[PDB]
Amino acid sequence: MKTFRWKVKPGMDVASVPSVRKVRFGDGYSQRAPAGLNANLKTYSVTLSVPREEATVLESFLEEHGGWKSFLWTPPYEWRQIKVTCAKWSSRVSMLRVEFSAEFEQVVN
Amino acid sequence: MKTFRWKVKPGMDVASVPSVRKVRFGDGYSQRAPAGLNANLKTYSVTLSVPREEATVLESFLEEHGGWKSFLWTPPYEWRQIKVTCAKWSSRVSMLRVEFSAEFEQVVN
Amino acid sequence: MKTFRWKVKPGMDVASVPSVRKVRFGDGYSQRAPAGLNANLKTYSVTLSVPREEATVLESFLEEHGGWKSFLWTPPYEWRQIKVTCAKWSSRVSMLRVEFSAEFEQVVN
Amino acid sequence: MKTFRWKVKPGMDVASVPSVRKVRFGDGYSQRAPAGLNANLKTYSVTLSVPREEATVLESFLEEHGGWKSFLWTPPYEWRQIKVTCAKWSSRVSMLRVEFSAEFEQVVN
Amino acid sequence: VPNPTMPVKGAGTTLWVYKGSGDPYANPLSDVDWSRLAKVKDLTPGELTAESYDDSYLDDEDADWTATGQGQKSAGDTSFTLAWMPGEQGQQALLAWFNEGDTRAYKIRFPNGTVDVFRGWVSSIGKAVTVITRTVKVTNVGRPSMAEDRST
Amino acid sequence: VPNPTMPVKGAGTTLWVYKGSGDPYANPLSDVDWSRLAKVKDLTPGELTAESYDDSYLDDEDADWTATGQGQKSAGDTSFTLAWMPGEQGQQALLAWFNEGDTRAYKIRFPNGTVDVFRGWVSSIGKAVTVITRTVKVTNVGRPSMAEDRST
Amino acid sequence: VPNPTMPVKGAGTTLWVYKGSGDPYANPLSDVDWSRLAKVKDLTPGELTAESYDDSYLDDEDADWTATGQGQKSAGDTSFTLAWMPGEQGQQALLAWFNEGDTRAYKIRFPNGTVDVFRGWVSSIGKAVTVITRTVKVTNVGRPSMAEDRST
Amino acid sequence: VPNPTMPVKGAGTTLWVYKGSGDPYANPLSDVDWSRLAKVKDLTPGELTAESYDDSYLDDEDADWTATGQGQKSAGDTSFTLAWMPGEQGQQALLAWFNEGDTRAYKIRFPNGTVDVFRGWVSSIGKAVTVITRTVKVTNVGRPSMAEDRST
Amino acid sequence: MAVKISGVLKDGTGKPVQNCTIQLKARRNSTTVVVNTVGSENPDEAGRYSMDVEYGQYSVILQVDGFPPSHAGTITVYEDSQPGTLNDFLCAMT
Amino acid sequence: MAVKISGVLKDGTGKPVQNCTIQLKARRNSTTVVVNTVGSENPDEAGRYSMDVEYGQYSVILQVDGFPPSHAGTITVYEDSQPGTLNDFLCAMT
Amino acid sequence: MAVKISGVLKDGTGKPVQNCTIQLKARRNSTTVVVNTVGSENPDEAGRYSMDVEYGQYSVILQVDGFPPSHAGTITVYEDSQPGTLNDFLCAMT
Predict the structure, then answer these.
(1) DSSP letter, residue B52
(2) What's phi and psi for F145, nearest 5 deg?
(3) Pairing between strand F104-109 and C43-51?
(4) Chains touching G (3+ CB pairs < 8 Å)
(5) Based on CB atoms within 10 Å of each CB, which residue in A39, D23, H5, H74 is the most buried?
(6) How far apart are CA G92 and CA G85, in angstroms?
(7) What is the nearest CA distance from B38 to chain J, expressed in angstroms?
(8) From edge to edge, which strands make up the β-sheet containing J70-77?
(9) What is the dihedral of CA H141, H145, H148, H149, to 10 degrees?
(10) Rounded Cα–Cα distance for residues E98 and E83 (Å)
(11) Which run of H or of E encompasses K11?
């Protein structure tokens, strides 16, 4: 398992939708259950900007994993060494720098 | 087999969604597979701007292939030369320069 | 068959989508066919702005053809003379001039 | 059958979609027919702005016909004295003036 | 001697406001009905602007040269400062006109002999507290009649 | 002696407006038909500007340096201040032109002997009340034929 | 004596424009092919700006301080006013160049002895009617070769 | 005598640019490596501004009074004008720095005895044609070390 | 009277140009022609054109199945002219 | 009269250009060629071109499938010109 | 006549570089080469290249599947040069 040591620009977004077993009744009393064990799985939206020289290197690294292989990554300042996979990324080549916008979905081993 | 040599304006976009076989189990354990062998095929959004004199030339070249023929094209700075087909294009003719917007979908042999 | 000598304001788009036959497979190798002989049929958006005095006249012309009669027209520039029909004309009467934003669809004889 | 002599603010919108009988063949040869004898019926989008004093009078007149009775109305400068009906109207009441934004759909006898 | 075709210094430049009922454009040369405003310090008449509409076309022989026409001309804004003087009925009626707020007609006369007539509504009333003066400006509405139309 | 190759103060600089029909560009040296305007206080001629379009490309051999070209050049706006002459026919014609509002051609003549011809429509009319002057501003349309095009 | 390392007052500061075909940067010191512009009233050369791109990062060890780098530097706009002259061939060529509108190269020479070459396209042609002067400005495109490269 | 606790006119105010490798913040008092710029006409140093962020809260026991905190402080832009010195190596190095475009460190010295060190990249290069001067502006990046941090 | 204007129009390669359309655009009111009136003529495959044009001031317009109107210039027909080719008026000293 | 222009066009590496087309645009109206008219011709598989051009001033354009149309230059054919390849007119002193 | 330029193209590690493409962009019209004409050459597996280059001014451009078009420089072929390698032309005094 490789890692991901590229730096991340400000504006990274984090989303969290834990899974629960909602079921609705007359006046509340909506019983709740924690569903699975590791219910919640954070989803990250990551933006980077690199000069065109190493854009090919980054693209090759992301292509090597495809959308089926996991790799270690440390979210900035966060106390967890999570494992994450990505399946959507785009790049805006303009003249000198290219900015990558990618999404990173957390997954257990 | 023709080729492509028209230069491209800044702001060109590229997107890539690798087709994977995702199946989620009880608690994570999400089985993932690469699906097809060469699953990752990029799609580019390309804009040009040419004076009206060669608008006919570009339109005729784009018409010759229709939407069923592939032509070799080397994306800017990228290493591998690819073959691509397109099926949608539009233009704005203002007074002197017509600007072209199209999408180029990479296809295998 | 009548003609259309009215002049068109800048901003026309020439959006075109040819008709092909797609059929998709795992690692591509998708076959392509040119479908009919006259695959492509351009679709223009014509914008005009005339003083109110003669506006009615143009309306009557577009009323005479309705949406079922084709008329010859020469798009500005481009080595072609085509026959077009229109069915979605619209006008904005404000004070002295009225601008028409109609749509023109190519049709073979 | 009443009439409509209230002033109309600039920016009136006009729409017209003729009803046609479209059927397409292999290579064009598209049969087209005018459908009904009087197919296209223009629909207007008309806005007014009056002080509050006679807003009640306008509302009462619009209420009298309901959404079923028709009334004669002459479009500005237009060569026809058509009869129209409306079924939607709204007002933005302020402390000095109120503005009405209604739609007038042309119907024949 | 007051007559055109030679320049005038512009010493008098009286200002009148309509009070009666009738057509102001019928004959502005007679002051039989309008009231004069007294001791105007300075005056700036409105300017008759226009508006430019696009005329550039695709198939025209001439390219790379913008083409623009004229449409929807409008009148300007007039302004003038008088010596603040609530005693006289002139600015009393002016302030009553502002408070009630209706369009009214007025004229400017010249030592040359020709008169200019405008119609509009007032939009501001100012003041100063050093040699007290009242500044008032109006915005015109509709077509004014210039002095040239009368000279023909 | 009026001729180029030595700079000129530019004292006369007469102003003319076309009245008749034909081609103003055919022979602007002939003042057979054009009407002169008298006692111009100040004049500012038009400013023939242009517009810039982007020319940078992905595969350009010289990066980190912006590139642009010129397109759709446009004429400027002319302004002139005259002594307010409600009697002289030229001013009446000018105001009638503004009121009716059609494109008209005019010229300015220099003491060096050459003439400059524009065409456009008037958009602004102003006035003053101390030594009365009238300010007229026009906007050109289409390509003007400069003095250089005639000098060859 | 013309030599660097000492300041120069800048009396001559001639301006030349290219006419022939070749590489302007091959040897700007030779004036065999370029045509001089005569009696320039004043000149303002373009300034070489840049663009600032963001560089701050989440894991960057130093916070509370912005980080910005430089990219996409561009040349400026040159302007100069001279005596309006419809006779000399230089201004004829200048106006023909504007009307046809293509990128062209030019240079400015200093009394010190070093020359500066730019390339661009012209975008304005002004005028004045008090001691007639013509003001003209161009916008540059591509890399200009500064005077500090020839000295090495 | 160069020593604080008495204000200084600031006549000398030398300017230096780093040329070597190492830590410019280690010992700016040693001018062993840095290169001096000659004949600075005028100088304006950077402005260490900050940014304001909202700090108002719903349940605060004091209302109707805004509360903003400070964050993300940034350095300003330095500017200086020199006598155009193409012969001197300092200006050649400065222009090479502009062309190649990397972050570089520099300092300004005072007759008081202490020095101020900044780091950044240049962004503008200007010129004049009457007593030629070159105007150069730079933008800093990252935290600078003020003179106070050295006096302690 | 109508003066005879006939000839063959060739491109710059000495080959007849087909799919041609020449238009005459009146600029002024004449004895028998109203201003702002157009007159069209389509030559044959050999490039031969033949017209009986009236006297007055005209502007010539050329369209080749997609060429924009090529304003080759204005022609004038006055009451001593002799029959010839269209290009003669374009090249005639005005 | 029209002058004959024949030759072979190649590239820097001594190879013929394929799928090419030479176009001549008349920038000036003449007694035999109308202004803003283009004459086009495509060479053979060996790059040999042979065409009879009319006198006048023309702009020459090279077209290749895929590449943007290149503006090779401007040529002038007088009445005293002699037959030769198209390149000689390009390199002729102007 | 065309000078024969032959040699072996290597990278900085003394190794052949594959998937190459050497082209010459014409900058000035010559006696036998038209301005703005390109000629491609693909070397073998061992990096051997050999071209027949006509005299004149060119810009040598080295396109690899990777780095964008690489401008090693402009090259000049007078009528006194001898056959050799391309690096000599790049390193030659101009």
Answers:
(1) G
(2) -100, 105
(3) unpaired
(4) A, F, H
(5) H74
(6) 9
(7) 28
(8) J38-41, J20-26, J56-64, J70-77
(9) 150
(10) 18
(11) none
Q: Are J41 and J49 in contact (CB under 8 A)?
A: yes
What is the three-state SS of chain I?
CCEEEEEECECCCCCECCCEEEEEEECCCCCCCCCCCEEEECCCCCCEEEEEECCEEEEEEEEECCCCCCCCEEEEECCCCCCECHHHHHHCCC
The residue among I21, J62, I20 whose CA lies nearest residue B57 is J62
What single-letter DSSP state applies at residue D104? E
CB A86 within 8 A of CB A75: no
| Of the candidates J75, J94, J78, G23, the residue with the CA atom closest to the CA atom of residue J86 | J75
Question: Locate tokens 């008098």: which residue?
Answer: E12
Distance between CA B108 and CA B70 in Å, rounded? 9
Determine the Cα–Cα distance for residues F92 and D26; give it in Å rounded to an integer. Answer: 69
Please tell me the distance from the alpha carbon of residue F46 to that of residue F77, in angstroms, as a whole number. Answer: 5
Residues 6+ apart with CB under 8 A from C106: C41, C42, C43, C44, C82, C83, C84
User: B63-98 burial by CB neighbour count: b if 16+ within 10 A, else e?
Assistant: eeebbbebbebbbbbbeeebebbbbebebbbbbebb
Size of interface E-I (CB pairs under 8 A): 4
Q: Residues B69, C32: contact at Cβ < 8 Å?
A: yes
Q: Which residues are CB-neighbours of A64 under 8 A, at least 6 positions away?
A: none
**Which residues pair with residue E77 across a beta bridge?**
E139
Length of chain B: 109
The helix/strand/coil state of B75 is: coil
- The label of the residue with tokens 């071209």 reads K51
Nearest to G151 by CA among F118, H95, F111: H95
Distance from CA of G51 to the nearest CA of H (A): 7
Residue ranges of E strands in chain C: 12-13, 43-51, 71-73, 82-86, 90-93, 97-106
Q: How would you class E47 by CB atoms within 10 Å of its CB: exposed for 0-12, middle for 13-18, buried for 19 or more?
A: middle
> How far is it, in rounded angstroms, from Cα E83 to Cα E106?
19
Q: Which amino acid is at F103?
A: T
d(CA H90, CA H97): 10
CA distance K79 to chain J (A): 15
Q: Which residues of B touch C74 (CB under 8 A)?
A: none
Q: Which experimental approach was used here?
A: cryo-EM
**Chain E residues touching residue I69 (CB < 8 angstroms):** 59, 61
SS3 B56: helix
DSSP-assigned beta bridge partners for residue F105: F119
3-class SS of residue E138: strand
Pair of tokens at residue I65 = 């199945």
Q: How much is the CA Rg of chain K, to the nearest whole Å?
A: 13
Please tell me the distance from the alpha carbon of residue G82 to that of residue G125, in angstroms, as a whole number: 11
User: Which helix H or strand E contains J33, and what residues bound it?
Assistant: none
CA distance G141 to C96: 43
What torsion, rounded to 10 degrees, do the Cα atoms G5, G8, G10, G13 define?
A: -30
The candidate with the shortest Cα–Cα distance to A38, out of H83, B26, D59, E4, is: B26
- Please list every residue in chain E whose beta carbon sits closer than 8 Å to the beta carbon of residue F125: 47-48
Q: Smallest Cα–Cα separation from I91: which of J23, J55, G92? A: J55
The token pair that represents D10 in the structure block: 């600039």
DSSP state of H10: -
What are the two backbone dihedrals, phi and then psi, of residue F90, each rounded to the nearest 5 degrees? -60, -40
Measured CA to CA, the distance from residue C76 to residue G58 in angstroms comes to 53
Contact list, G140 vs chain F (CB under 8 Å): none
Interface test with C, best of B42, B68, B92 (most C CBs within 10 A): B68
Helix (H, G, I), strand (E, B) or coil at F111: coil
Q: Which two tokens stand for residue H15?
A: 């300017």
What gap in Å lies between CA G23 and CA K85, rounded to an integer? 26
